[PDB]
């Protein structure tokens, strides 16, 4: 993946941008803390970061500072957690994250063809974003769905047993505005 | 011949030995050593083998410059050999070689550091000149000049 | 003015004169180190009383020459490799990171490397 | 002997078989600074090299100032 | 609890739970290490200390593996030799070839341990190249070259646990993991610069010291620090006439391998604003003069004003050596004068702690007993800024035990948890009578610490009365073995000046309008009266407000240029060692007074340093016992505390303000330091600015 | 021991009546974890209060008049250093080396 260990202030991502959990996420965050002992409430950083990431769209520096202040922890401790796990998107990202597995079990059944077909359709190389901020192609490791090796992931949904002609249809569905059937 | 060193055991040469023990015998020996040295030089030219010229140990011998500028370990060894030097195990030695003047020996004392603790230099000329009184007594003044010359005296060696 | 001749500055506020013997270098007026003794002060010694200052060794300032070299811009790579452009006759090979949005010089040669994507930002 | 240019000093001493005027363009030295006429040894003249310290003094004295008491 | 183990056939015995690497050191067996430090938490991320347990098929890290009874440890088998070469090769795989341009060259642990335990040749010929890491900006003190880091986490462990600054950590995963602060900010800690010493490689280096020297050039002198009253032991490195850098040296009783950023980075002020020549004022300008002319002018100026008994005033600064204090006192005494004091602004003419009893103004518990403290009370003090090393020691005890620290006075940013009570004597009275005073009474080894800024407030008398009454009325504070009363000074000359009685206990004397003022390094004289017609002589090593207020200036030597005696806050006598000579025609400070004495008709009987030091014994017998604290006996200590109990004295309820305003500007050397100027601009006066405004 | 061996050593009288030697054991450097240099006792001389170092004006060289400035003797034991200093009739003083207090260190303490 794209691993950078240094944050650079941007108009899209800088600590000045205010962030706060909505009144819906304020209540649901309290249940998360209740799943941990009171003297070890620092173990809820991971769910809180994802809660903010889904609300805002990505794990901005404002979200990391907000979680640090919420749990009475130094900001650097939250920075270590967010930068260690690859599912914390420290950049705006697109509406649908395209995750293509390239590991050996998936590579045997033609995962290379899946990557080739998508690159020439969306016209974005892996790690890039479509101009309309709709798609995001990402190269990912094993996701566990290796028995159905030609497998891809869009946001939170899996898509197994694919072919290059099938992957275009899935992209066409999201481009049009229709959710393809996952399976 | 008594304690061969540095490939002197792989060349053939002879030693001239006098009988009367005077200057003329020593002149003849030094002329034979001239031809025997030329005999050895010819063998070294023919029998020069390939291979490294220094020990393949970068903790004592400096690494090559090209390897120094490309290898991390070579740079470290180059840096430390020129700034701190190499440590020598503690102990002492008395190493002697057949110097052209005679027997030249060094008594080096090591303390486990990178600097010798003591370095006694044994000079054959220093010992030769100490016998000048015993040898030149009764001779005439021009004979002393010959005796000084026949001892092959260099006073840097004597006064090291 | 004797203030530009005795103070270390990043740049000379005027154009150096190659025929002026009070400059630190023929191509640079001011010294380039805080501990570098000014040439004008050094030449004001009893040993220069009857000595011609023109024939004294006056090598060119290396700080002004190195910054006349254009920045090397690297395409499709965030790491620059420099070994002195001579190989075995250069300097030890080092790798320079180019992630930051600025030119970063070599630790030995002083040649500055940067990415081509930052070319517009650096030049302005 | 010092009047011989450093280019031809090496050739005279049998250090090489290629004179500096026969040098390949890649074998020549590249100077970013201008080149002047050869200057021989300047001893026994007024142009002799005069050594000097290139470093400033290691301690700077205090610049005195007077402040009036209230 | 001892366990008899074996290390390469050597019997060892240490406490249960000790690491193998600790037992190996006790047995004389050396094990290479990068990530292990005897003052940090245990990490096993470097794998250089691997040893072979006798009956086990796995190699154990000796820094983390606990010791067992009957355990036999091998440390020099060919299997371990393979491991050391293999780990060394991995460390040097991506390391940059930077030794010539790297300031750690001659003192690099990576170089020495790779030479000693690694192979002589490398095998990395990859054309893809090494890893490249950008350099982080964390302020003007720590220079970063992160290509050279070996990911050993010494800096992370120290700054989080010892220094208490959690803004430094490890961000990333795998080969892309980078040490730093992630965001663009600086490290805010008075002990941050100790990270430079702990970093075994050139990744973290001193920025002021960068490129200026190699360790083999420097000469090492074991002297003491005078920038605070702790007397931290330091190793001053010199290259001929100039001091290059200051490093800490081990002393578990005083500083424990740590020094503050003020101590090690103020050495560059020794080259700026120095007093090198005698100066004589002529109107509004100072002109140079000879020593004979300067001393004659003082004698001529002495007879111009004709001062009487108490019209001769002597003031001693924070950096004044003890030999000069006694010499100035005796010269003052020979002139029939007793008006001697320090440049402080104590409200009461006799300080509330007084000078009759040593126990009233020293750290009676000693710094090394903080490891045993159960309860600590801070009365109007800021240990983080006044005693940076001592503050870190309290945090270490706080982390590893249930020690509770209560604070009375002005709140401050602390490295531990403070149970704040109030900001006046009224809260202290409530605390010592309430639950807070019950904890101290029930504590087995309680501690009470009074700040040096208490005597500079209008409630100085009340604070020492409240504590003394509580101390005398409770039998556990003062015992034959324990003494819980402590005073934390911030100047290295206070305890030495008080041990010799260089203070006026007579209010009438201190109110005299002086005609001849002798400033011996005194510079905080804005609030101390100086008559416009008075004749002022300043003796010191830096030109400052004291020099500007003088008429004749006598240049002296600094603490690095003289063998001088300093008594720290715990009553420990320590002697400096001269590393260089004073610049110009500056002289030793005690010789200037002796030479001037002959010009005033009061020739002192001192001729050499030994005679001067013999005078110290006459003034106080404990001043010739170096590195030894002479404690006050239990019976005498109670009388001194009882003398502080003064009934019929009111409490004004004023704030116990912290004495230090700017951490980097506390004396002449620090003010003259260009590095401290950069620290104020970047870190701030209170070290509170997280963003560097002078770094681009 | 009691013999005044300085009467026959040939050294100048200034070594006795004007110079002070320090018997010390080298402290561990704060920048390195090695302790090899701390295993031996050494003797050096205190600097001259004047003339220890001064700057030569021609080239900036470090001029000196102290002939003992670069002499550092090495001893294996403290008693040997004292016996030699007493034998030569030197004015000396001993700096006792600082000993590190032993504290147990285990990985379990990182959580307990
Ligand atoms: S840290 Fe050590 S090995 Fe690395 S470049 Fe510096 S001196 Fe060389
Ligand atoms: S920067 Fe230095 S101290 Fe910190 S982990 Fe790297 S090598 Fe260790
Ligand atoms: S190998 Fe691709 S999902 Fe497991
Ligand atoms: S010293 Fe034990 S693994 Fe680092
Ligand atoms: K370091
Ligand atoms: Zn280069």
TrEMBL record, chain A:
[2Fe-2S] cluster binds at residues 101, 106, 142, 146. GO terms for molecular function: 2 iron, 2 sulfur cluster binding; metal ion binding; NADH dehydrogenase (ubiquinone) activity; oxidoreductase activity. Transmembrane segments: none annotated. Binds 1 [2Fe-2S] cluster. Its EC number is 1.6.5.3. Its cofactor is [2Fe-2S] cluster. Keywords: 2Fe-2S, Iron, Iron-sulfur, Metal-binding, NAD, Oxidoreductase, Translocase, Ubiquinone. One of its GO terms (biological process) is mitochondrial electron transport, NADH to ubiquinone. The keyword Glycosyltransferase does not apply. It comes from the Eukaryota. One of its GO terms (cellular component) is mitochondrial inner membrane. It is an enzyme of class 1 (oxidoreductase). Belongs to the complex I 24 kDa subunit family. This is NUHM (24 kDa) subunit of mitochondrial NADH:ubiquinone oxidoreductase (Complex I). The lineage of its organism: Eukaryota, Fungi, Dikarya, Ascomycota, Saccharomycotina.
TrEMBL record, chain C:
It comes from the Eukaryota. GO terms for molecular function: oxidoreductase activity. Keywords: Oxidoreductase, Ubiquinone. It holds the Pfam family zf-CHCC. It is an enzyme of class 1 (oxidoreductase). Residues 14-41 are annotated as: Disordered. One of its GO terms (biological process) is mitochondrial electron transport, NADH to ubiquinone. This is NUMM (13 kDa) subunit of mitochondrial NADH:ubiquinone oxidoreductase (Complex I). It comes from Komagataella pastoris. The gene is numm.
From TrEMBL, chain D:
It is a peripheral membrane protein. The keyword Electron transport applies. GO terms for molecular function: oxidoreductase activity. It is found in: Mitochondrion inner membrane. One of its GO terms (cellular component) is mitochondrial inner membrane. Belongs to the complex I NDUFA12 subunit family. Accessory subunit of the mitochondrial membrane respiratory chain NADH dehydrogenase (Complex I), that is believed not to be involved in catalysis. Complex I functions in the transfer of electrons from NADH to the respiratory chain. The immediate electron acceptor for the enzyme is believed to be ubiquinone. This is NADH dehydrogenase [ubiquinone] 1 alpha subcomplex subunit. The chain holds residues 71 to 140 of 140 of the full protein.
From TrEMBL, chain F:
GO terms for cellular component: mitochondrial inner membrane. The keyword ATP-binding does not apply. It comes from the Eukaryota. GO terms for biological process: electron transport chain. It is a peripheral membrane protein. Its main location: mitochondrion. It is found in: Mitochondrion inner membrane. Transmembrane segments: none annotated. Keywords: Electron transport, Membrane, Mitochondrion, Mitochondrion inner membrane, Oxidoreductase, Respiratory chain, Transit peptide, Transport, Ubiquinone. GO terms for molecular function: oxidoreductase activity. Belongs to the complex I NDUFS4 subunit family. Accessory subunit of the mitochondrial membrane respiratory chain NADH dehydrogenase (Complex I), that is believed not to be involved in catalysis. Complex I functions in the transfer of electrons from NADH to the respiratory chain. The immediate electron acceptor for the enzyme is believed to be ubiquinone. This is NADH dehydrogenase [ubiquinone] iron-sulfur protein 4, mitochondrial.
